[PDB]
């Protein structure tokens, strides 16, 4: 792991490395010439507000006073301009850490005001920031005069801070070795001038976050034991002290460079970490970037642990590999993601971890490093750092290439909303009073909706366990421009503010009906009567009895089909507490196959009920208590109806459905009286099964009926007969007999027939198909029935992906467990994404991973090759490779069916439709027009044939228990029943209500292929015609001609339809 990470950090270094002639002289030229002009600037007199306005209206350039601008009745001071006194480079360029980032990067350029312009109280009430804006305005006007009008310029904000307005210059052209600087869109893209303050002029101890530095009330803000009365403004205080202390930070950072020059690749890897994790130094993205990463790395060089011993993986004689492992470990575990908001703080040198206070404190300066960061971004970093911890903690699979993207902040549940708080007193329930204007640094609505939805969706159990339906939250201010032009003072917006709510859900308690609270008080406690409960709820406060004899303040939600109770939560509480700004969620994927039971749609109970409860009562205990010449050894259910993979969560009755007959392997004890011939072994299996059947019919559950039918799933085995048991509640169960000498004799049949020299391929396919039928399905279903308790999105995710492959017509050749392990690849090894807390998110994850996987060099390994790739370089026999610890061969569910594999077949089409899915989701978005995903194109087909079924209306959907076809009235209630389908004869008319094209295309999957190969909606395994025989699909076959048959010679081993030429 370690040497691989070293060499992979080196390859990314030589890939994102730089050019020396680019750096010097391309940046150096403009740096020197801009400093020349900024020193040829002249200084003006100390002028008041009226002179400032009087020149600012007449000149083209405007000031940047943030709201609110100071009036002349509140402004008694004077503002001046003076000659700049200093020059330094800051950020990443003075440290030489910069990398070629394809979008942009900005080199920040300090200029510091002289000390004679300021007054010792100017850190009170917005004065110094007004002088700062005026200094910037004069620098602006005179640089417009001395550039002779050739370079363009815009107004911006530094790090998204609305209290630091800045200017960023943009070029337009490129020559060889002149001024102009366009082609370097990383280093020479942006030169952001920053106005700052000198060092140690304002009292930092009063610049502490807990002191309120905006005085608005003067009546009653005393006699309260110090200063809790004047409320603390941490964003404003921290911003002021950071603007005055930009300098000695870079001094300390340069010190850390020359004490360890591994800082280069250190913050290179940290910067690519942040750029891929989608954050930044912008306050909209959390305000965590290269600067914070560097200064946290520095203080963790000079300490960090509790006993102030040095950070053990951070001695100055290490490399960037272990340095980045150290930072991801510390950011995950000690006090640097969410713990610096809930349970502790850090110190600067000598650095320590103490168990109090939300702050990233530095002491000699009195500054929070995490002032732009909230608890939202905190828990986000905690998740990301835990993921990186386990990804660099594993030691079998390479994890340098996977880098995390925020599926938690961009889920499928993009609840867009339009909230127009104009006017504020009538369209916002929280009063944005002058106190709120002082506290919030123009992010009041953000903090408000953060707290509102977090307390809205958090629950509280009875044992004190703080369990919620959410773990993360972030508001993304879409259409928030940080750049504006030269003729306007603020950044105004006329289209309102869009508020995006991206929540990573908790699937263990997502779909729970009950919302929980505190003990329903004898006297109403403040927790019962706060802004989290009965007042905050209103009409949904009630009293509900538990299963544990305590009675608490509770809620009762609804469990429904097309959307979620969390969607109901957010709609109702948003409309109540922010305002009536509307909510819509129209991403339709919950319209799956809808099972016909009580309370549509039933949650994870119906599959359980029918399969498991009818399995227990009654056939299993009865079959184990029968008397027989041979005793049974195991009764293990191996179906999707147990393992949560069935396309239809089954009901009581549906003998017309595909996956309703439940296949289970049965076996008897070790007995040597089985014969040595396969036909004889299968006939003794039949005879034993007939004894079981007669006793099952003669005992008192004789309302169950049995029958012994033949099977044709295997080739060259025509004597296989089962017992499908028809339970009194309409369940179906196919039993099969597995024998050790049966396995060894079929290995012998694969062994012999050496003379003809051309039988070993078909012998191998029949052997592997037989092993698939009998051996490994036990271990598969035990593993996934174990995994379903920790991953609850699995069965609806499998239903979505198998529905997509069904409407695209490929699962006739694709086995269902192939699709199962393909989705468990996105589930159980979820890197580089989060856990799928929605079935929709899981479906999109499989779709995008299948869009970004190639079958040519990358195999699929999932934690639930070099002898095959060499003999198959063009891979005409095998396209996929899915190997586990359960199967290390990787060819067990892939090449046993005999999938044709040129570039003009099922597999390449599968690849192409996944690509087109990724294209359309990337291009137009997620809207109502997504259903081009679920309609098929029917292109690239040589001959097309439409078929029609001889059924009456609402057939077969009503007996496959799915509820489209409004023409059958009552599909949303309980009108359909199957105890009348429970038949009187086993002949027609019981199997006449089945669908014929399924087994027609089994014969049309039983003879040709050497002529042609087709795929239709029929033989789609464990799926009937219904959802593709409604409007959502159609009954078609599309037959393509293989490229191997164009024209050939007259043979006898021809098989095809050839004509004379």
């Amino acid at each position: 792991r370690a040497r691989a990470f070293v060499l992979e950090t080196e390859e990314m270094l030589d890939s994102v490395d730089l050019d020396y002639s680019e750096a010097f002289d391309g940046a150096d030229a403009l740096l020197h010439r801009l400093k020349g002009s900024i020193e040829t600037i002249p200084a003006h007199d100390a002028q008041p507000l009226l002179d400032a306005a009087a020149k600012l209206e007449k000149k083209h350039k405007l000031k940047v006073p943030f709201p609110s601008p100071p009036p002349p009745q509140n402004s008694n001071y004077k503002v001046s301009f003076a000659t700049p006194a200093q020059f330094n480079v800051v950020g990443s360029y003075v440290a030489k850490t910069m990398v070629r980032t394809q979008s942009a990067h900005g080199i920040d350029m300090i200029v510091v005001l002289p000390e004679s312009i300021l007054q010792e109280k100017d850190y009170l009430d917005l004065r110094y920031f007004y002088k700062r804006a005026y200094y910037l305005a004069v620098v602006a006007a005179h640089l417009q005069k001395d550039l002779k009008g050739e370079a363009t310029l815009s107004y911006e904000y530094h790090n998204g801070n609305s209290l630091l307005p800045v200017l960023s210059v943009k070029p337009n052209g490129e020559k060889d070795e002149d001024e102009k600087k366009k082609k370097k869109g990383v280093l020479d893209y942006r030169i952001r001038i920053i106005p700052c303050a000198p060092e140690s002029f304002f009292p930092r101890q009063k610049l502490h976050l807990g002191a309120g530095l905006v005085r608005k009330h003067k009546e009653g803000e005393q006699q309260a034991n110090g200063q809790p009365a004047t409320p603390a403004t941490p964003f404003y205080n921290s911003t002021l002290v950071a603007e005055s202390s930009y300098l000695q930070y870079l001094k300390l950072l340069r010190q850390t460079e020359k004490k360890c020059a591994a800082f280069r690749n250190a913050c290179i890897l940290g910067r690519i970490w942040l750029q891929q994790r989608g954050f930044g130094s912008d306050v909209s993205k959390g305000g965590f970037g290269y600067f914070e990463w560097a200064v946290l790395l520095a203080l963790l060089l000079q300490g960090g642990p509790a006993d102030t011993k040095g950070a053990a993986p951070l001695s100055p004689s290490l490399s960037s590999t272990q340095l980045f492992k150290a930072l991801i470990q510390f950011l995950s575990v000690t006090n640097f993601a969410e713990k610096p908001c809930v349970l502790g703080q850090a110190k600067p040198d000598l650095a320590g971890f103490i168990e109090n206070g939300p702050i990233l404190w530095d002491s000699a300066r009195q500054l929070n490093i995490a002032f732009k960061m909230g608890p939202w971004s905190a828990d986000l970093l905690h998740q990301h750092a835990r993921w990186t911890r386990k990804l660099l903690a594993d030691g079998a699979v390479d994890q340098f290439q996977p880098t995390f993207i925020l599926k938690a902040d961009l889920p499928t549940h993009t609840y867009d909303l339009v909230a127009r708080m104009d006017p504020e007193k009538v369209s916002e329930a929280a009063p944005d009073k002058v106190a709120h204007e002082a506290r919030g640094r123009h992010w009041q609505v953000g903090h408000k909706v953060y707290r509102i939805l977090r307390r809205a969706l958090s629950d509280k159990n009875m044992e004190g366990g703080e369990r919620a339906r959410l773990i993360h939250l972030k508001v993304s201010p879409g259409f928030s421009s940080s750049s504006w032009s030269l003729n306007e003072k603020p950044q105004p917006q006329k289209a309102g503010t869009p508020i995006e709510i991206g929540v990573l859900f908790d699937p263990l308690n997502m779909a729970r009906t009950v919302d929980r609270g505190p003990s329903a008080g004898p006297s109403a406690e403040e927790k019962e009567t706060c802004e989290k409960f009965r007042r905050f709820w209103g009409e949904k406060s009630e009293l509900r009895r538990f299963g544990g004899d305590t009675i608490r303040e509770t809620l009762v939600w609804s469990a429904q089909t097309p959307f979620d109770l969390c969607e109901e939560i957010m709609r109702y509480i948003l409309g109540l507490h922010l305002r009536v700004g509307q909510l819509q969620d129209d991403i339709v994927f919950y319209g799956r196959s809808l099972p016909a039971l009580l309370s549509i749609k039933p949650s994870d109970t119906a599959l359980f009920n029918v399969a498991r409860k009818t399995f227990t009562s009654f056939e299993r205990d009865l079959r184990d208590l029968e008397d027989l010449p041979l005793r049974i050894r195991h009764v293990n259910p191996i179906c999707p109806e147990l393992r949560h993979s069935s396309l239809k969560t089954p009901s009581f009755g549906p003998s017309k459905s595909g996956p309703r007959p439940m296949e289970v392997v049965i076996s008897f004890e070790a007995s040597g009286k089985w014969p040595e011939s396969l036909i004889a072994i299968q006939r003794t299996k039949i005879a034993f099964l007939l004894m079981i059947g007669r006793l099952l019919e003669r005992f008192k559950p004789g309302e169950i009926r049995t029958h012994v039918g033949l099977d044709d799933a295997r080739y060259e085995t025509e004597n296989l007969a089962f017992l499908d048991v028809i339970y009194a509640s309409g369940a179906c169960f196919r039993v099969r007999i597995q024998a050790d000498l049966e396995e060894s004799l079929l290995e012998r049949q694969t062994k012999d027939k050496t003379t003809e020299q051309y039988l070993r391929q078909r012998a191998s396919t029949q052997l592997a198909s037989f092993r698939r039928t009998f051996v490994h399905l036990p271990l598969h279903t035990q593993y996934i029935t174990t995994a379903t308790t920790r991953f609850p999105a699995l069965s609806p995710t499998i239903r979505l992906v198998k529905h997509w492959f069904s409407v695209h017509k490929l699962s006739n050749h694709f086995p269902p467990e192939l699709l199962e392990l393909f989705v468990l690849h996105t589930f159980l090894a979820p890197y580089p994404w989060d856990v799928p807390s929605s079935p929709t998110t899981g479906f999109l994850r499989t779709l995008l991973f299948l869009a970004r996987w190639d079958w040519r060099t990358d195999p699929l390994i999932i934690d639930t090759l070099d002898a095959w790739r060499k003999l198959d370089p063009g891979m005409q026999h095998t396209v996929l490779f899915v190997a586990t610890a359960h199967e290390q061969s990787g060819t067990m569910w892939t090449s046993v069916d005999g999938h044709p594999r040129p570039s003009k077949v099922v597999a390449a089409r599968m690849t192409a439709l996944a690509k087109s899915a990724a294209r359309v989701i990337r291009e137009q978005g997620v809207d109502l027009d997504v259903r081009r995903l679920f309609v098929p194109s029917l292109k690239e087909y040589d001959v097309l044939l439409y078929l029609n079924t001889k059924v009456l209306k609402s057939a077969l959907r009503t007996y496959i228990t799915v509820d489209p076809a409004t023409e059958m009235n009552g599909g949303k209630g309980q009108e359909i029943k199957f105890k009348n389908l429970a038949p009187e004869t086993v002949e027609p008319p019981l199997p006449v209500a089945q669908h014929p094209v399924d087994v027609l295309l089994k014969q049309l999957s039983a003879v040709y292929d050497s002529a042609a190969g087709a795929s239709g909606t029929g033989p789609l395994v464990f799926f009937r015609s219904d959802t593709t025989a409604t409007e959502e699909g159609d009954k078609v076959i599309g037959a393509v001609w293989n490229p191997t048959l164009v024209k050939r010679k007259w043979r006898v081993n021809l098989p095809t339809s050839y004509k004379p030429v």
Partner: protein, 124 residues
């Protein structure tokens, strides 16, 4: 460095203090698996009669299993350490280790275990 450590080990193989120095460098480079590898290398290649060096490697590995390990690994190494060394002494070392680490509840469970098992002959 690891090559320096291997050179000083081929110079002095029985040297438990250098063994713990090498695995402690592996703690500083966070490779606890290679630290286990080094500890078992000490347990094999440290010679038969050097009981004090063996118990030094043992109690260091117990420090690892209480500090960075988990319950199952600390109990299996406790079993192996009493299987190959003195039960009373490895129990008292884990007790003082619990005293140092502050894990006082499981410390109390170990104390009642050792006054049950070895209160018959130890007054200490």
């Amino acid at each position: 460095t690891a090559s320096d450590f291997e050179r000083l080990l081929l110079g002095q193989p029985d040297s438990s203090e250098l063994w713990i120095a090498y695995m402690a460098s592996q703690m500083q480079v966070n490779d606890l698996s290679s630290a286990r590898q080094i500890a078992e290398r000490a347990l094999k290649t440290i010679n038969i009669r050097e009981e004090t060096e063996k118990l030094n490697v043992w109690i260091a590995y117990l420090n690892l299993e209480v500090a960075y390990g988990t319950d199952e690994t600390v109990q299996e190494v406790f079993k192996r350490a009493c299987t190959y060394n003195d039960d009373r002494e490895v129990h008292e070392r884990l007790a003082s280790i619990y005293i140092q680490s502050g894990k006082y509840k499981e410390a109390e469970d170990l104390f009642e275990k050792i006054v049950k098992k070895y209160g018959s002959e130890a007054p200490h």
